[PDB]
Amino acid sequence: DRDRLRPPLDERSLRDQLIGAGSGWRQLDVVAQTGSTNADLLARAASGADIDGVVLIAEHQTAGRGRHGRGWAATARAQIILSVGVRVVDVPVQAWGWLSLAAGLAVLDSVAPLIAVPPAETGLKWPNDVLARGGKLAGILAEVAQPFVVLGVGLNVTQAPEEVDPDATSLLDLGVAAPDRNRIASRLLRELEARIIQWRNANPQLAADYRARSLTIGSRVRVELPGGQDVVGIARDIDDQGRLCLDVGGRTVVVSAGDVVHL
Ligand SMILES: Nc1ncnc2c1ncn2[C@H]1CNC[C@@H](COS(=O)(=O)NC(=O)CCCC[C@@H]2SC[C@@H]3NC(=O)N[C@@H]32)O1
C-alpha cells in the first residue's frame, strides 16, 4: 500500500536548500494540514503580509480549490501541495496569464526526467494541466491579491487515482518506485523561480518552451467555456496574453479560459 512510500517532508532541509544568497525564496513553511494553501496565502496578503517569494506547503489539504469554483482532492503526504506568492504589479496586466502557463512548464520540467519512458500524451494541456500518459499529474491555480498573484500547485506523487479523480495519475503510478518529495519539491521550486524571472522579463524562451511541451497545440479539441457552451476546433497557438487560439472551420476563436478535451 502507498502509505509506506509517504514519509514526511523535511522542512529544515528545504529551507537550507532554497533560502539564502542566490535564491529568491524568502520564506518556507510546511504545515501538517490546512483547508487551502492558496486561501491561506491570499489571507496573509489581505492582512498586509509581503508574500513575494513566500512558500507554503501542506502535507494534507482538506478543502482544496480548483479553477472555476471546482475542488481539488488529496490524501495526506500523497502530493506536493504548495502555494507561492508573486509580486505582479510591475508587469502589465495583459501578461499575467502567462505566469500561470509558466508555472505549469516549471512543474512539468521538474518531474519529466523522473519518468522511465516518455509515454504518449505527456506534456501541458492548456492552460497548465500537467499530463502524463493522458492522466492528470498536476493542477495549477492562479489567484489575485493585489499587488500579488498566488500560484498553487497540486502534484500527485504517490496519490492513487481512486482517492481523487478517475483521470488522475501520479509519479508512483508512472513507475517512479520511491519518489522523494524533498528532492521533487526542491526541483519544482528552483524551476519555478527561473520561470517567474523569465515571465517578469518577457523572455521569449518562456513561450517557446511552453509551445515545445504543449499537448494542445495541433490537436483537435473541444473546449468547454465558462457559461456552459462548447466549442470544437483545432488548437493552433497561444497568444501574448496566454489565451488559446482555435481554428473553428476556418474561423479563429480566441479563448481566455476553458476546459480542453483532446479529441
Ligand atoms: N488530486 C487530483 N489529481 C487530479 N485531478 C484532481 C485531483 N483532485 C481533484 N481533481 C479533479 C476533479 N475535478 C475538478 C478538477 C479541478 O481541475 S481544474 O479546474 O483544472 N483546476 C486545477 O487543476 C487547479 C488545482 C489547483 C490545486 C492546488 S493544491 C495547492 C493550491 N491550494 C488550493 O486549494 N489549490 C491549489 O480536479
Coordinates of C-alpha atoms and ligand atoms in Angstrom, one line a residue:
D1 CA 0.0 0.0 0.0
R2 CA 1.2 3.5 -0.9
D3 CA 1.3 4.9 2.7
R4 CA 4.6 3.2 3.3
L5 CA 6.0 5.3 0.5
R6 CA 4.9 8.6 2.0
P7 CA 7.5 9.8 4.6
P8 CA 7.1 13.4 5.9
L9 CA 8.6 16.4 4.2
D10 CA 11.8 17.8 5.9
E11 CA 11.1 21.5 6.3
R12 CA 14.6 22.3 7.6
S13 CA 16.3 20.7 4.6
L14 CA 14.0 22.6 2.2
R15 CA 14.9 25.9 3.9
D16 CA 18.6 25.0 3.7
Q17 CA 18.4 24.3 0.0
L18 CA 16.0 27.1 -1.0
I19 CA 16.5 30.1 1.2
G20 CA 19.8 32.0 1.0
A21 CA 22.1 34.0 -1.3
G22 CA 21.4 33.2 -4.9
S23 CA 17.8 32.3 -4.2
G24 CA 14.7 34.5 -4.4
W25 CA 12.6 32.4 -2.0
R26 CA 12.3 34.4 1.3
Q27 CA 10.2 32.1 3.5
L28 CA 9.1 28.5 3.5
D29 CA 6.8 26.7 5.9
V30 CA 5.4 23.2 5.9
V31 CA 2.1 22.7 7.7
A32 CA 0.5 19.4 8.6
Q33 CA -2.9 20.3 7.4
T34 CA -5.0 23.2 6.0
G35 CA -8.1 23.9 4.0
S36 CA -6.4 25.5 1.1
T37 CA -2.8 26.8 0.8
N38 CA -3.9 29.3 -1.9
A39 CA -6.6 30.6 0.5
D40 CA -4.0 30.8 3.3
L41 CA -1.5 32.9 1.3
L42 CA -4.3 35.1 0.0
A43 CA -5.4 35.7 3.5
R44 CA -1.9 36.7 4.6
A45 CA -1.7 39.2 1.8
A46 CA -5.1 40.5 2.7
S47 CA -3.8 41.4 6.1
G48 CA -0.7 43.2 4.8
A49 CA 2.0 40.5 4.5
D50 CA 4.6 40.8 1.8
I51 CA 4.1 37.4 0.3
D52 CA 6.5 37.8 -2.6
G53 CA 8.8 34.7 -2.7
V54 CA 6.9 33.1 0.2
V55 CA 6.3 29.4 0.0
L56 CA 3.6 27.4 1.9
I57 CA 3.5 23.7 1.6
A58 CA 0.8 21.5 3.2
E59 CA 1.2 17.8 3.9
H60 CA -2.6 17.4 3.7
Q61 CA -5.3 19.7 2.3
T62 CA -9.0 19.2 3.1
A63 CA -10.8 22.0 1.2
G64 CA -8.7 22.3 -1.9
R65 CA -9.8 24.5 -4.7
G66 CA -9.6 24.1 -8.4
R67 CA -10.3 26.6 -11.2
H68 CA -13.8 27.9 -11.9
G69 CA -15.0 27.1 -8.4
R70 CA -14.2 23.4 -8.5
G71 CA -12.4 21.3 -5.9
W72 CA -9.0 19.7 -5.5
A73 CA -8.7 16.4 -3.6
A74 CA -5.8 15.0 -1.6
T75 CA -4.8 12.4 0.9
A76 CA -2.1 13.1 3.5
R77 CA 1.5 13.2 2.2
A78 CA 0.5 11.8 -1.2
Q79 CA 1.1 15.1 -3.1
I80 CA 3.3 18.1 -3.1
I81 CA 0.7 20.7 -2.3
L82 CA 2.1 24.2 -2.3
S83 CA 1.4 27.9 -2.9
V84 CA 3.8 30.7 -3.6
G85 CA 3.4 34.5 -3.7
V86 CA 4.5 36.6 -6.7
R87 CA 4.5 40.4 -6.9
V88 CA 3.0 41.2 -10.3
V89 CA 2.1 44.9 -10.1
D90 CA 5.2 45.8 -12.1
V91 CA 4.1 43.7 -15.1
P92 CA 1.3 44.8 -17.4
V93 CA -1.9 43.1 -16.5
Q94 CA -2.3 41.7 -20.0
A95 CA 0.7 39.5 -19.4
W96 CA -0.4 37.9 -16.1
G97 CA -2.0 34.9 -17.9
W98 CA 1.5 33.8 -18.9
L99 CA 2.5 33.5 -15.2
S100 CA 0.1 30.6 -14.9
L101 CA 1.4 28.9 -18.0
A102 CA 5.0 29.4 -16.7
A103 CA 4.1 27.5 -13.5
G104 CA 2.8 24.5 -15.5
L105 CA 6.0 24.5 -17.5
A106 CA 8.1 24.5 -14.3
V107 CA 6.2 21.7 -12.7
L108 CA 6.4 19.6 -15.9
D109 CA 10.2 20.2 -16.3
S110 CA 10.8 19.3 -12.6
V111 CA 9.2 15.8 -12.9
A112 CA 9.7 14.9 -16.6
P113 CA 13.2 13.4 -16.1
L114 CA 11.7 11.0 -13.4
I115 CA 9.5 9.0 -15.8
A116 CA 11.2 6.0 -17.4
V117 CA 9.9 6.1 -20.9
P118 CA 8.1 9.3 -22.2
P119 CA 4.7 7.9 -23.0
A120 CA 2.1 9.5 -25.3
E121 CA 0.2 12.5 -24.1
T122 CA 2.9 13.7 -21.8
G123 CA 3.2 17.5 -21.5
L124 CA 1.0 20.5 -21.0
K125 CA -2.8 20.7 -21.6
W126 CA -3.9 24.3 -22.0
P127 CA -3.8 26.1 -19.8
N128 CA -1.4 24.3 -17.5
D129 CA -2.7 20.8 -16.6
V130 CA 0.4 18.6 -16.4
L131 CA -0.4 15.3 -18.2
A132 CA 1.5 12.0 -18.4
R133 CA 0.0 9.0 -20.3
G134 CA -3.1 11.1 -20.7
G135 CA -3.6 11.3 -16.9
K136 CA -3.6 14.5 -14.9
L137 CA -0.4 14.6 -12.9
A138 CA -0.7 18.2 -11.6
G139 CA -3.2 21.0 -11.5
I140 CA -2.3 24.7 -11.1
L141 CA -4.4 27.6 -9.8
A142 CA -3.5 31.3 -10.0
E143 CA -5.4 33.8 -7.9
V144 CA -5.1 37.6 -7.5
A145 CA -4.4 39.5 -4.3
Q146 CA -3.1 42.9 -5.4
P147 CA -0.2 43.5 -5.7
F148 CA 0.3 39.7 -5.9
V149 CA -0.7 36.6 -7.6
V150 CA -0.8 33.4 -5.6
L151 CA 0.3 30.3 -7.6
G152 CA -1.0 27.0 -6.3
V153 CA 0.3 23.6 -7.4
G154 CA -1.1 20.2 -6.6
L155 CA 1.3 17.5 -7.8
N156 CA 0.3 13.8 -7.5
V157 CA 3.4 12.0 -6.2
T158 CA 2.0 8.7 -4.8
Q159 CA -1.6 9.8 -4.9
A160 CA -3.9 7.0 -6.1
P161 CA -6.4 8.0 -8.8
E162 CA -9.4 6.3 -7.0
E163 CA -8.6 8.6 -4.0
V164 CA -9.0 11.8 -6.0
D165 CA -10.3 11.5 -9.6
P166 CA -10.6 8.8 -12.2
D167 CA -8.4 10.7 -14.8
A168 CA -5.6 11.4 -12.3
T169 CA -2.2 9.8 -12.3
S170 CA 0.9 10.0 -10.1
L171 CA 4.6 9.7 -10.3
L172 CA 4.4 6.4 -8.5
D173 CA 1.8 5.1 -11.0
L174 CA 4.2 6.2 -13.8
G175 CA 6.9 4.0 -12.5
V176 CA 8.9 6.2 -10.1
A177 CA 9.4 3.5 -7.5
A178 CA 10.3 5.6 -4.4
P179 CA 9.6 9.2 -5.2
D180 CA 11.4 11.6 -2.8
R181 CA 9.2 14.6 -2.2
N182 CA 12.0 16.7 -0.7
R183 CA 14.0 16.3 -3.9
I184 CA 11.0 16.9 -6.0
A185 CA 9.8 20.0 -4.1
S186 CA 13.3 21.5 -4.4
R187 CA 13.4 20.9 -8.1
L188 CA 10.0 22.3 -8.6
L189 CA 10.7 25.5 -6.7
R190 CA 14.0 26.0 -8.5
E191 CA 12.3 25.6 -11.9
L192 CA 9.5 27.9 -10.8
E193 CA 11.9 30.6 -9.7
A194 CA 13.6 30.7 -13.1
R195 CA 10.3 30.7 -15.0
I196 CA 8.9 33.5 -12.8
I197 CA 12.0 35.6 -13.6
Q198 CA 11.6 34.8 -17.4
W199 CA 8.0 35.9 -17.2
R200 CA 8.8 39.1 -15.4
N201 CA 11.4 40.0 -18.0
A202 CA 9.3 38.9 -21.0
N203 CA 11.9 36.3 -22.1
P204 CA 10.8 34.8 -25.4
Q205 CA 12.2 31.5 -24.3
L206 CA 9.2 31.1 -22.0
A207 CA 6.7 31.0 -24.8
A208 CA 9.0 28.8 -27.0
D209 CA 9.5 26.3 -24.2
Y210 CA 5.7 26.2 -23.5
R211 CA 5.0 25.5 -27.2
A212 CA 7.6 22.7 -27.2
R213 CA 5.8 21.0 -24.3
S214 CA 2.2 21.7 -25.4
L215 CA -0.1 18.7 -26.0
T216 CA -2.9 21.0 -27.0
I217 CA -1.4 22.8 -29.9
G218 CA -2.0 20.9 -33.1
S219 CA -4.8 18.8 -31.6
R220 CA -8.5 18.7 -32.4
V221 CA -10.2 19.9 -29.2
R222 CA -13.5 20.5 -27.6
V223 CA -13.3 23.5 -25.3
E224 CA -15.9 23.8 -22.6
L225 CA -16.3 27.5 -21.9
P226 CA -17.4 29.3 -18.7
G227 CA -21.2 29.7 -19.1
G228 CA -21.5 26.1 -20.3
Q229 CA -21.1 26.5 -24.0
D230 CA -18.7 24.2 -26.0
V231 CA -16.5 25.0 -29.0
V232 CA -14.9 22.3 -31.1
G233 CA -12.0 23.2 -33.3
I234 CA -8.2 22.7 -33.8
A235 CA -5.9 24.4 -31.3
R236 CA -3.3 26.4 -33.3
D237 CA -1.4 28.6 -30.8
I238 CA -1.2 30.6 -27.6
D239 CA -1.3 34.4 -27.9
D240 CA 0.6 37.1 -25.9
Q241 CA -2.0 37.1 -23.2
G242 CA -1.7 33.3 -22.7
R243 CA -5.0 32.7 -24.5
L244 CA -5.8 29.7 -26.6
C245 CA -6.2 30.3 -30.4
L246 CA -8.6 27.9 -32.1
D247 CA -9.3 27.2 -35.7
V248 CA -13.1 26.6 -36.0
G249 CA -13.7 25.6 -39.6
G250 CA -11.6 28.4 -40.8
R251 CA -12.8 31.0 -38.3
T252 CA -10.5 31.9 -35.5
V253 CA -11.8 31.9 -31.9
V254 CA -9.5 33.1 -29.0
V255 CA -10.4 31.7 -25.6
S256 CA -9.3 33.2 -22.3
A257 CA -10.5 30.3 -20.1
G258 CA -12.0 26.9 -20.6
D259 CA -11.7 23.1 -20.2
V260 CA -9.9 21.4 -23.0
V261 CA -10.6 17.9 -24.2
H262 CA -8.1 16.5 -26.7
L263 CA -10.1 14.6 -29.4
Ligands
LIG1 N1 -5.5 15.2 -6.9 C1 -6.1 15.3 -8.1 N2 -5.5 15.0 -9.2 C2 -6.0 15.1 -10.4 N3 -7.3 15.7 -10.6 C3 -7.9 16.0 -9.5 C4 -7.4 15.9 -8.2 N4 -8.3 16.3 -7.3 C5 -9.4 16.8 -8.0 N5 -9.2 16.6 -9.3 C6 -10.1 17.0 -10.4 C7 -11.5 16.8 -10.0 N6 -12.4 17.6 -10.8 C8 -12.1 19.1 -10.8 C9 -10.6 19.2 -11.2 C10 -10.2 20.7 -11.0 O1 -9.5 21.0 -12.1 S1 -9.1 22.4 -12.6 O2 -10.3 23.1 -12.9 O3 -8.4 22.2 -13.8 N7 -8.2 23.1 -11.5 C11 -7.0 22.7 -11.2 O4 -6.5 21.7 -11.7 C12 -6.2 23.5 -10.2 C13 -5.9 22.7 -9.0 C14 -5.0 23.5 -8.0 C15 -4.7 22.7 -6.7 C16 -3.7 23.4 -5.9 S2 -3.2 22.4 -4.5 C17 -2.4 23.8 -3.7 C18 -3.3 25.0 -4.0 N8 -4.3 25.2 -3.0 C19 -5.5 25.0 -3.5 O5 -6.6 25.0 -2.8 N9 -5.5 24.8 -4.8 C20 -4.1 24.8 -5.3 O6 -9.8 18.4 -10.5

